[PDB]
Design a protein around this ligand. Structure first.
Ligand SMILES: [Ca+2]
Length: 240
C-alpha cells in the first residue's frame, strides 16, 4: 500500500498473509480474506506459481512476533475456471484456498463479510485497501499492516479512455486513482473493505495496477468485484 497508515491490530481481522516457502524461510507474497474457518479468498494470479503456500491469520507485523498469529498450510487451491494468467484484464482473478486446519476466531481472526450478490457501489464510496505490499512503486514490503483510504471509481469513469479504457470490466471494482494512495505489489489477493449501511464488507480482491507504477493518477487500483462471484464461491465451498 502506497500512501497508507498503519492499521490498528484489530481493525481488519479477516486479512491474511499468503506466504510461500523460500529455502528455510517463508516469504509474504499476497493478501487474502478469511471467509470460513477453513477457507481463504485470494486472487488467482497469486497462486499461478507451483509453490508451497501457507496462510497466516492474526498477523500484524511480518517481521516480529505479534503473539496472535496462527500458521496453517494450504490443502487445496480452487482457481476460477475461466482465469487466464496471460489475460488479467479479462477478469476472473479469484481463487479459494482450503486450509489444512480450521483456524480459531478471536478479535484478531474473524470471517470477512461479503456483499450480497450483484451489489454495485455508488461512485466515490468510502473504502480502505489493506495489505503488506510495497510502500512505494519499486519499493519494499511493509512490515506492519497498512490501510489506505481509496474511494471507488464507478465503471463509467473507470472504463473511460483517460482511466483504464477497455481494460476494466464490470466484473471489477476500481478504487483510488489520486496519484498518492494505491495498492501495490504484495497487496494482491487482499481485501478492499467498503462501508455500507454501517458495516464494512469485502467488496474487492486486489488484482492489478498500471505497468507504469502503483500510485498513478487516473489508474485506480483494480479489484475483482466480489459481488459478481457469490454463487461461484458458495458452489466451490459446497462441493469441497
Ligand atoms: Ca507477526
Amino acid at each position: 500500500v502506497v500512501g497508507g497508515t498503519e492499521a490498528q491490530r484489530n481493525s481488519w481481522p479477516s486479512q491474511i498473509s499468503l506466504q510461500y516457502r523460500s529455502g528455510s524461510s517463508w516469504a509474504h507474497t499476497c493478501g487474502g480474506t478469511l471467509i470460513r474457518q477453513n477457507w481463504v479468498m485470494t486472487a488467482a494470479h497469486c497462486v499461478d506459481r507451483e509453490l508451497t503456500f501457507r496462510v497466516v491469520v492474526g498477523e500484524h507485523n511480518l517481521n516480529q512476533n505479534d503473539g496472535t498469529e496462527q500458521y496453517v498450510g494450504v490443502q487445496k487451491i480452487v482457481v476460477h475456471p475461466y482465469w487466464n494468467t496471460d489475460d488479467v484484464a479479462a477478469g476472473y482473478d479469484i481463487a479459494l484456498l482450503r486450509l489444512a486446519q480450521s483456524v480459531t476466531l478471536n478479535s484478531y481472526v474473524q470471517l470477512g463479510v461479503l456483499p450480497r450478490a450483484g451489489t454495485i457501489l455508488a461512485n466515490n464510496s468510502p473504502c480502505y485497501i489493506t495489505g503488506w505490499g510495497l510502500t512505494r512503486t519499486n519499493g519494499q514490503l511493509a512490515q506492519t499492516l497498512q490501510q489506505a483510504y481509496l474511494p471507488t471509481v464507478d465503471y463509467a469513469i473507470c472504463s473511460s479512455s483517460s482511466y483504464w479504457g477497455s481494460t476494466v470490466k464490470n466484473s471489477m471494482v476500481c478504487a483510488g486513482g489520486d496519484g498518492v494512495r494505491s495498492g501495490c505489489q504484495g497487496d494482491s489477493g487482499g481485501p478492499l473493505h467498503c462501508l455500507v449501511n454501517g458495516q464494512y464488507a469485502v467488496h474487492g480482491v486486489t488484482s492489478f495496477v498500471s505497468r507504469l507504477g502503483c500510485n498513478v493518477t487516473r489508474k485506480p487500483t483494480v479489484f475483482t468485484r466480489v459481488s459478481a462471484y457469490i454463487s461461484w464461491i458458495n458452489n466451490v465451498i459446497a462441493s469441497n
